[PDB]
């Protein structure tokens, strides 16, 4: 139980992830 959200296609163990995941997409 942690996050699913999967933004473009991801699920993350952590909002941190989730947060560090849009800084590598190209976007931020």
């Known amino acids: 139980q942690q996050y699913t959200a999967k933004i473009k296609g991801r699920t993350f163990r952590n909002e ?13």
Not at 16 to 28: P, V
């Open 16 to 28: 941190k992830e989730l947060r560090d995941f849009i800084e590598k997409f190209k976007g931020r």
